[PDB]
Design a protein around this ligand. Sequence first.
Ligand code: GDU
Ligand SMILES: O[C@@H]1[C@@H](O)[C@H](O[C@@H]2CO[C@@H](O)[C@H](O)[C@H]2O)OC[C@H]1O
Ligand code: CL
Ligand code: CL
Ligand code: MN
Length: 238
Amino acid sequence: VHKMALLVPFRDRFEELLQFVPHMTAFLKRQGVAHHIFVLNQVDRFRFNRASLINVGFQFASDVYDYIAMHDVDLLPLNDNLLYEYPSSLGPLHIAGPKLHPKYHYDNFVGGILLVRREHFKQMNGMSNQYWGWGLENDEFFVRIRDAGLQVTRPQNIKTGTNDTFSHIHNRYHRKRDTQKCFNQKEMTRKRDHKTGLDNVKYKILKVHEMLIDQVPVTILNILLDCDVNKTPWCDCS
Ligand SMILES: O=c1ccn([C@@H]2O[C@H](COP(=O)(O)OP(=O)(O)O[C@H]3O[C@H](CO)[C@H](O)[C@H](O)[C@H]3O)[C@@H](O)[C@H]2O)c(=O)[nH]1
Ligand SMILES: O[C@@H]1[C@@H](O)[C@H](O[C@@H]2CO[C@@H](O)[C@H](O)[C@H]2O)OC[C@H]1O
Ligand SMILES: [Cl-]
Ligand SMILES: [Cl-]
Ligand SMILES: [Mn+2]
């Protein structure tokens, strides 16, 4: 039996989380996937850093989890044929493929829901830490996948399409995307990051909370990320 660490980078998405937990738990129980949900709550006051939270969650998750799912909290599978299985030796298994995602349709999109073996994640030194605020972190990770000699696989013979494979309950005016650029964020985050990753993410876990949501156990990690403003000053544009 494989076990999946279901990693949910998180800040101020409480109602999303209330829908997320019962839905994913039922969904995964139906296909027999053993798993645990880790809410990666970024409690520092820097801009949202999804990828660094993933790195922290990977470090925290015990050895029993031999793969991880990096998972948006607002993106729910509607098709039971989307198998959250242990990825093959080829590399990561991308569940929310561009032919299936309601919004993102470019070929190398690996955002939303991406399953990665422990060994492969380690092999790539996890995700880049330089992505403060919305965007690009998954795209650079795609390059990390190619550079590691791995490939992305996606489920075949899925019959649903872009409008009926996932619900993406995300109103752009309610949950705003932090797309601000300051300092030379534009230039720096558009290039491959060979310098940061799993092995040097800087952080403290202030608190671990064990939460039951209608009987389903879920772990909350209160994560205080560090920002080195000598390297990534765009962690805060205030
Ligand atoms: O202030 C935030 C911002 C994001 N999130 C979490 O991060 C996830 C992804 O963020 P968004 O939903 O705001 O962004 P998108 O809907 O545009 O999703 C896509 O854009 C992101 C770019 O950063 C990621 O690549 C993401 O996986 C990809 O599906 C959210 O679902 C949520 O789980 C928060 O919890 N709080
Ligand atoms: O992090 C990813 C974003 O970088 C990505 O942004 C896309 C970049 O190319 C543009 O043509 C697209 O319109 C734009 O969405 O979107 C997905 C996100 O995961
Ligand atoms: Cl890039
Ligand atoms: Cl494919
Ligand atoms: Mn979203």
